[PDB]
Amino acid sequence: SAVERNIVSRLRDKGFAVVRAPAPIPDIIALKNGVIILIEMKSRKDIEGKIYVRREQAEGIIEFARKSGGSLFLGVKKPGVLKFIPFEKLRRTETGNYVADSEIEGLDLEDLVRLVEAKISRTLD
Amino acid sequence: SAVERNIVSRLRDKGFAVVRAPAPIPDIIALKNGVIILIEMKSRKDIEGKIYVRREQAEGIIEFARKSGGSLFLGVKKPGVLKFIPFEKLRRTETGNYVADSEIEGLDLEDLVRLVEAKISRTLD
């Protein structure tokens, strides 16, 4: 919640129109000049130390991303920095839940925004 | 609220990923395959019988539409049918408030969805 609010505010300072899902929809929906990004914040840690997204939540947000045509990301708060993982890098486990392996480390906020800004540029050009 | 809920449900039956602004953001944010539409529901009627959007609300949602790159519409519930007016057809009055003149009559839901579907088609092709 503290982290969500920080992320919304920084995306709004960076020019995005943002909405938080009301209390399954991605936690954060952020729009900028025609581009849609969807951010699910640090769902959880299983008994092996891996951040995970439970089955039904993962499927709800993957379907919201598929219909919207929006790019979906898992955001993970670290006592260090914020990392965003493209949902497609998560691994569907044997139980249908989704886990982030460690190597990953996603994008920082600037990298994420830059992905958005490059898509805007292709559309303009 | 009754009308908002109906509209969300019908847009979701039509393939959109939809979010309601939490209790200024457009009431309805609807996404489908890369296209963003923003719907503000039947703000109000002034002493001359015209549906209006107050200054600060209108400016908040116009700015949300400008940053998102989303198409903004005023939806008006009628004891008859639902009409959607492209926000650009509203008239800025002498006081900075926005009113819908009568002639207007916007799009029905199918027409609105068709605008969305044609933009998807141009992007695909």
UniProtKB/Swiss-Prot annotation, chains A, B:
<dbReference type="Pfam" id="PF01870">
    <property type="entry name" value="Hjc"/>
</dbReference>
<dbReference type="InterPro" id="IPR002732">
    <property type="entry name" value="Hjc"/>
</dbReference>
<feature type="binding site">
    <location>
        <position position="27"/>
    </location>
    <ligand>
        <name>Mg(2+)</name>
    </ligand>
</feature>
<protein>
    <recommendedName>
        <fullName>Crossover junction endodeoxyribonuclease Hjc</fullName>
        <ecNumber>3.1.21.10</ecNumber>
    </recommendedName>
</protein>
<keyword id="KW-0238">DNA-binding</keyword>
<keyword id="KW-0540">Nuclease</keyword>
<comment type="subunit">
    <text>Homodimer. Interacts with PCNA subunit PCNA1.</text>
</comment>
<feature type="binding site">
    <location>
        <position position="40"/>
    </location>
    <ligand>
        <name>Mg(2+)</name>
    </ligand>
</feature>
<keyword id="KW-0234">DNA repair</keyword>
<dbReference type="InterPro" id="IPR014428">
    <property type="entry name" value="Hjc_arc"/>
</dbReference>
<dbReference type="GO" id="GO:0006310">
    <property type="term" value="P:DNA recombination"/>
</dbReference>
<dbReference type="GO" id="GO:0000287">
    <property type="term" value="F:magnesium ion binding"/>
</dbReference>
<dbReference type="GO" id="GO:0006281">
    <property type="term" value="P:DNA repair"/>
</dbReference>
<keyword id="KW-0460">Magnesium</keyword>
<keyword id="KW-0233">DNA recombination</keyword>
<keyword id="KW-0378">Hydrolase</keyword>
<feature type="binding site">
    <location>
        <position position="4"/>
    </location>
    <ligand>
        <name>Mg(2+)</name>
    </ligand>
</feature>
<keyword id="KW-0227">DNA damage</keyword>
<dbReference type="GO" id="GO:0003677">
    <property type="term" value="F:DNA binding"/>
</dbReference>
<comment type="similarity">
    <text>Belongs to the Holliday junction resolvase Hjc family.</text>
</comment>
<dbReference type="InterPro" id="IPR011856">
    <property type="entry name" value="tRNA_endonuc-like_dom_sf"/>
</dbReference>
<keyword id="KW-0255">Endonuclease</keyword>
<comment type="function">
    <text>A structure-specific endonuclease that resolves Holliday junction (HJ) intermediates during genetic recombination; may have some degree of sequence preference in a mobile junction. Cleaves 4-way DNA junctions introducing paired nicks in opposing strands, leaving a 5'-terminal phosphate and a 3'-terminal hydroxyl group that are subsequently ligated to produce recombinant products. Can cleave all 4 strands 3 bases 3' of the junction center. Cleaves both mobile and immobile junctions. Modifies the structure of the 4-way DNA junction, a model Holliday junction structure.</text>
</comment>
<keyword id="KW-0479">Metal-binding</keyword>
<feature type="site" description="Transition state stabilizer">
    <location>
        <position position="42"/>
    </location>
</feature>
<dbReference type="GO" id="GO:0008821">
    <property type="term" value="F:crossover junction DNA endonuclease activity"/>
</dbReference>
<dbReference type="InterPro" id="IPR011335">
    <property type="entry name" value="Restrct_endonuc-II-like"/>
</dbReference>
